[PDB]
Design a binder for this molecule. Structure first.
Ligand SMILES: [Ca+2]
Length: 212
């Protein structure tokens, strides 16, 4: 169908918004700052994790102003490497647009950038985690990650290769496209403990959403 092709060359307020001045609270141990949303000279979204106060942490999230439905989502990215942090790409609808909570994820646990974590939420329920081995260290360069979201399945790919398939209670509300980098608290078993290492950066080259 129709193709949304976002090359992330500069901030376009019509299509994107920078989260700012707040914290998601919970496992999220940092405050979203618009100042942490940058663009490189060669057109990369540069998400930055800083400490602008002794044990205070500044993090970053970029998200779509519009909403999207079924189809192919691809991203070319380069995650941060560190204990206690997540770099991600996901779809998201919750009460955000006064609905139930539906979500599709691609998460890189900074403690082990040699792996990826797939997962999804359907009406607030998750626990669909799937960890796969990359065969490479994600943090060294840009690679291509995607999910094909249709009404009866989700399919995850890496550099073009089917890695995972999900068939049950597949989400169905449309949602926004989101990218964020953050340090977790009291999920250590999951993310490892964050040692305050900073600044940390996650990089995005482009996003493409292909409808139908
Ligand atoms: Ca680009």
């Amino acid at each position: 169908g129709s193709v949304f092709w976002e090359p992330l060359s500069y901030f376009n307020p019509s299509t994107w918004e920078k989260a700012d001045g707040y914290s998601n609270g919970g496992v999220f141990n940092c405050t979203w700052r618009a100042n942490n949303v940058n663009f490189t000279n060669d057109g990369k979204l540069k998400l930055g994790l800083t400490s602008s106060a002794y044990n205070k942490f500044d993090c970053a999230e970029y998200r779509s102003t519009n909403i999207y439905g079924y189809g192919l989502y691809e991203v070319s990215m380069k995650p941060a490497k560190n204990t206690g942090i997540v770099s991600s790409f996901f779809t998201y609808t919750g009460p955000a647009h006064g609905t139930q909570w539906d979500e599709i994820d691609i998460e890189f646990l900074g403690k082990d950038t040699t792996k990826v974590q797939f997962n999804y939420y359907t009406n607030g329920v998750g626990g669909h985690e799937k960890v796969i081995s990359l065969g490479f260290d994600a943090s060294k360069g840009f690679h291509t990650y995607a999910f094909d979201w249709q009404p009866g399945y989700i399919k995850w790919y890496v550099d073009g290769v089917l890695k995972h398939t999900a068939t049950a209670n597949i989400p169905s509300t449309p949602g926004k496209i989101m990218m964020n980098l953050w340090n977790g608290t009291g999920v250590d078993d999951w993310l490892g403990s964050y040692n305050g290492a900073n600044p940390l950066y996650a990089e995005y080259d482009w996003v493409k959403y292909t409808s139908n």
